[PDB]
Design a protein around this ligand. Structure first.
Ligand SMILES: *[C@@H]1O[C@H](CO)[C@@H](O[C@@H]2O[C@H](CO)[C@@H](O[C@@H]3O[C@H](CO[C@H]4O[C@H](CO)[C@@H](O)[C@H](O[C@@H]5O[C@H](CO)[C@@H](O[C@@H]6O[C@H](CO)[C@H](O)[C@H](O)[C@H]6O)[C@H](O)[C@H]5NC(C)=O)[C@@H]4O)[C@@H](O)[C@H](O[C@H]4O[C@H](CO)[C@@H](O)[C@H](O)[C@@H]4O[C@@H]4O[C@H](CO)[C@@H](O)[C@H](O)[C@H]4NC(C)=O)[C@@H]3O)[C@H](O)[C@H]2NC(C)=O)[C@H](O)[C@H]1NC(C)=O
Ligand SMILES: *[C@@H]1O[C@H](CO[C@@H]2O[C@@H](C)[C@@H](O)[C@@H](O)[C@@H]2O)[C@@H](O[C@@H]2O[C@H](CO)[C@@H](O[C@@H]3O[C@H](CO[C@H]4O[C@H](CO)[C@@H](O)[C@H](O)[C@@H]4O)[C@@H](O)[C@H](O[C@H]4O[C@H](CO)[C@@H](O)[C@H](O)[C@@H]4O)[C@@H]3O)[C@H](O)[C@H]2NC(C)=O)[C@H](O)[C@H]1NC(C)=O
Ligand SMILES: *[C@@H]1O[C@H](CO)[C@@H](O[C@@H]2O[C@H](CO)[C@@H](O)[C@H](O)[C@H]2NC(C)=O)[C@H](O)[C@H]1NC(C)=O
Ligand SMILES: *[C@@H]1O[C@H](CO)[C@@H](O)[C@H](O)[C@H]1NC(C)=O
Ligand SMILES: *[C@@H]1O[C@H](CO)[C@@H](O)[C@H](O)[C@H]1NC(C)=O
Ligand SMILES: *[C@H]1O[C@H](CO)[C@@H](O)[C@H](O)[C@@H]1O
Ligand SMILES: *[C@H]1O[C@H](CO)[C@@H](O)[C@H](O)[C@@H]1O
Ligand SMILES: *[C@H]1O[C@H](CO)[C@@H](O)[C@H](O)[C@@H]1O
Ligand SMILES: [Ca+2]
Ligand SMILES: [Ca+2]
Ligand SMILES: [Ca+2]
Ligand SMILES: [Ca+2]
Ligand SMILES: [Ca+2]
Ligand SMILES: [Ca+2]
Ligand SMILES: [Ca+2]
Ligand SMILES: [Ca+2]
Ligand SMILES: [Ca+2]
Ligand SMILES: [Ca+2]
Ligand SMILES: [Ca+2]
Ligand SMILES: [Cl-]
Ligand SMILES: [Cl-]
Length: 552
């Protein structure tokens, strides 16, 4: 169909009132004698006395102004008839639209906005978005907002672009730098219409942009002198504090120092840890040092951040080691041994080791000067008295021919302590240790342990066991040989199974009585006792749990 033309009324009608809106007229008005009147939301219902028509001319007036931000449109109906009563007259639905006018300024949803952006951000990266509202007619100049920057802190250089239409904030081609300016605080303005700058006061808010930190600054040592100082024989003491400076955000892992030993500490003498409060590398000892051995313990360390460096600065960074000298102070220690342990090798044979020979010494030296010190040497824990120690020259000599088979000998080594006391006050007592390693010679033959034993009549076998006290290879496995004496007995008594140091023996005939069984037990070297190894074996009759039948 066709839309109706609505009269255009200007909101906030200054005047003069009563305001002439328009004039409705009927053509069937010359025949009859038509009056005029009006009815709808705006005259007879919500609200009344806005408009009214003269009952004859058809002229519609207005008597009160109105706000378009309350009454967008208005649908009324036009009926106008004579004073008789007129029934079939189609009333046109007149409509009346109130035009809009910029009667309200744009306003921010907040009096203060807050945003944040990383340092070294690529250009045209979105920071945040401010926003405001205009209660006027949308899609008209009276509602088109135009955002502008009034002022900026610290004003220069300009690192921010404000899209005046969207309110979105962006970073410019000039790169941001937190170390230059860490935070930006801004005052903004919003305009309507053509976004034109006049001298008219418009509302304004504020924006506070915080710049976030990135690790884009290498650490630097500030210490003028880097020399350490430590005493001899000390532990757990502070060597040096390396004061390091970093530009990045204090407290962050981008600012916290980090240390690693480049060289000079795979001996493990130093431990380093970072003081998170002053940013000092605290290096400390974890091992005593002997000045008489090491007069300087210089070393190097490389510096960095707990967090990795930003890509922007990588490979421009050459890890350059930093040297730091350390000196050791001397201290009096008195007499000592060059070695707490001496190894002395002796033999069980009279052909080399002789009872009463000198076999070594234990000279005590004043640790500080290194010269032979006057001391009083003394034996200690010589369980079988193998040694004589001269109290004056510390010379050591045999008191017995050393017996490798001695129960006091262990691992083939006979351990003996020694002590030295210093002259002058105070008496310092230090202990030495001598490992006497004895050469084992084949001086023991395999002998039985139970040469006289008595078995039962129901016994299955016999267990003869030998014993060569020598250590390998002068004992090793034995070779058992039952010999034919008396004759035939080699057959009467047989070997069943043999081990290294024993053999299981069974008699074939199984007669009840004593038998003297001669063996020849031989070493692993072939040696065998001069004595006849004879087994005197008596077979009695065993009653159950009764041993032998002791008579009737
Ligand atoms: C205000 O009041 C007015 C009072 O009349 C009124 O005006 C009237 O409106 C009518 C339309 O609805 C008009 O009718 C048209 O008339 C023309 C020609 O008419 C003239 O010529 C005729 C012969 O020459 C004559 O007979 C006509 O009528 C007579 O007129 C006298 C006075 O002039 C009347 O006497 C008065 O009576 C009083 C008491 O009642 C009193 O005594 C007075 O003293 C006395 O003078 C008399 O009563 C009257 N008689 C009649 C019968 O009207 C007049 O002189 C025609 O050509 C038109 O024809 C169309 O309409 C017909 C309707 O059926 C169809 O049959 C036709 O075919 C044709 O239809 C279509 O037309 C279109 C073109 O328009 C074509 O394209 C189509 O093809 C066609 N369709 C087909 C099918 O063919 C029509 O009849 C009337 O003339 C007019 N009168 C006056 C005086 O103005 C107003 O309308 C009122 N105001 C409002 C706003 O409503
Ligand atoms: C002929 O008899 C030989 C000895 O006679 C026996 O001696 C004891 C063990 C009793 O059985 C007794 O009834 C007999 O008269 C026999 O030689 C022995 O044989 C056994 C098994 O073949 C060997 O046992 C092994 O012992 C070693 C350690 O032994 C030495 O160390 C222990 C301390 O741990 C000393 O107490 C002993 O005196 C030995 O000097 C073990 O490592 C191993 O495992 C378990 O055995 C021992 C008990 O013997 C446990 O205490 C451990 O904790 C382990 O759980 C073996 O059991 C034995 O060494 C060997 N020699 C001696 C001197 O006992 C011989 O085998 C017989 N003839 C034949 C043909 O078998
Ligand atoms: C800060 O120093 C520590 C201490 O050494 C570094 O940790 C070492 O890293 C290397 C390389 O992967 C490993 O081989 C070591 O085993 C690590 N040692 C320890 C104790 O963790 C750490 O990498 C350094 N931090 C930075 C960012 O360089
Ligand atoms: C802009 O203002 C409207 C109206 O309050 C709101 O719905 C919208 O979220 C705002 N935009 C932003 C980015 O806050
Ligand atoms: C002494 O014997 C023990 C026990 O088997 C062994 O651990 C040690 O290495 C031996 N000492 C030597 C071979 O000097
Ligand atoms: C160390 O050895 C003994 C242990 O008492 C002392 O008597 C000696 O004088 C030295 O101090
Ligand atoms: C060395 O060693 C003994 C014990 O082995 C100590 O008790 C003594 O004081 C000496 O200095
Ligand atoms: C040799 O061995 C003893 C251990 O029994 C040590 O304590 C001593 O100091 C010496 O060097
Ligand atoms: Ca208004
Ligand atoms: Ca408005
Ligand atoms: Ca506006
Ligand atoms: Ca920077
Ligand atoms: Ca930074
Ligand atoms: Ca850093
Ligand atoms: Ca020393
Ligand atoms: Ca010293
Ligand atoms: Ca011996
Ligand atoms: Ca021996
Ligand atoms: Ca032997
Ligand atoms: Cl280079
Ligand atoms: Cl054999």
């Amino acid at each position: 169909r066709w839309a109706p033309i609505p009269c255009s009324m200007l909101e906030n009608s200054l005047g003069p009132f009563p305001l002439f809106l328009q004039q409705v007229q009927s053509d069937t008005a010359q025949n009859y004698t038509i009056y005029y009147s009006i009815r709808g939301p705006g005259v007879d219902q919500e609200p009344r006395n806005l408009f009214y028509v003269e009952r004859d001319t058809g002229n519609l007036y207005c008597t009160r102004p109105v706000d378009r931000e309350q009454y967008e449109s208005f649908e009324i109906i036009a009926f106008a008839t004579t004073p008789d009563g007129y029934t079939p007259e189609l009333p046109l639905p007149l409509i009346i639209k109130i035009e809009d006018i910029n009667d309200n300024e744009p306003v921010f949803t907040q009096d203060v906005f807050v945003g944040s952006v990383e340092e070294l951000s690529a250009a045209h990266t979105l920071v945040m978005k401010i926003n405001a509202t205009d209660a006027d007619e949308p899609n008209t100049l009276n509602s088109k907002i135009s955002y502008r920057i009034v002022s900026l802190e610290p004003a220069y250089p300009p690192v921010f672009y404000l899209n005046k239409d969207t309110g979105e904030i962006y970073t410019t081609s000039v790169t941001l730098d937190r170390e230059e300016h860490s935070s930006y605080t801004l005052t903004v303005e919003a305009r309507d219409g053509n976004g034109e700058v006049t001298d008219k006061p418009v509302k304004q808010a504020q924006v506070q942009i915080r710049i976030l930190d990135v690790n884009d600054n290498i650490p630097v040592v500030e210490n003028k002198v880097l020399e350490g100082m430590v005493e001899e024989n000390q532990v757990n003491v502070e060597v040096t504090r390396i004061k390091v400076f970093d530009a990045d955000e204090i407290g962050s892992d981008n600012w916290l120092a980090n240390f690693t030993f480049a060289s000079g500490n795979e001996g493990g003498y130093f431990h380093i840890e970072t003081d998170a409060q002053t940013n000092e590398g605290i290096v400390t000892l974890i091992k005593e040092v002997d000045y008489e051995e090491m007069k300087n313990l210089d070393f190097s360390v490389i510096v960095a951040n707990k967090a990795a460096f930003h890509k922007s600065i990588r490979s421009k960074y050459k890890p350059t080691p930093i040297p730091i000298k350390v000196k050791v102070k001397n201290v009096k220690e008195g007499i000592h041994f060059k070695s707490s342990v001496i190894s002395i090798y002796v033999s069980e044979s009279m052909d080399r080791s002789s009872k009463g020979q000198i076999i070594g010494n234990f000279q005590a030296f004043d640790e500080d000067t290194g010269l032979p010190a006057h001391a009083r040497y003394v034996k200690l824990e010589d369980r079988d008295n193998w040694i004589s120690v001269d109290s004056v020259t510390s010379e050591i000599k045999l008191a017995k021919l050393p017996d490798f088979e001695s129960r006091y000998v262990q691992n083939g080594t006979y351990t003996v302590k020694i002590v030295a006391i210093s002259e002058d006050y105070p008496r310092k007592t230090i202990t030495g240790t001598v490992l006497i390693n004895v050469e084992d010679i084949n001086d023991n033959c395999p002998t039985l342990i139970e040469p006289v034993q008595t078995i039962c009549h129901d016994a299955e076998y016999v267990n003869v066991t030998a014993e060569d006290l020598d250590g390998h290879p002068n004992s090793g496995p034995f070779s058992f040989s039952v010999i034919d004496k008396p004759p035939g007995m080699a057959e009467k008594w047989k070997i069943a199974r043999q081990e290294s140091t024993s053999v299981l023996l069974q008699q074939s005939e199984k007669k009840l009585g004593r038998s003297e069984i001669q063996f020849l037990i031989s070493d692993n070297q072939g040696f065998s006792c001069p004595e006849k190894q004879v087994l005197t074996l008596t077979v009695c009759e065993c009653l159950h749990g009764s041993g032998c039948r002791e008579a009737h």
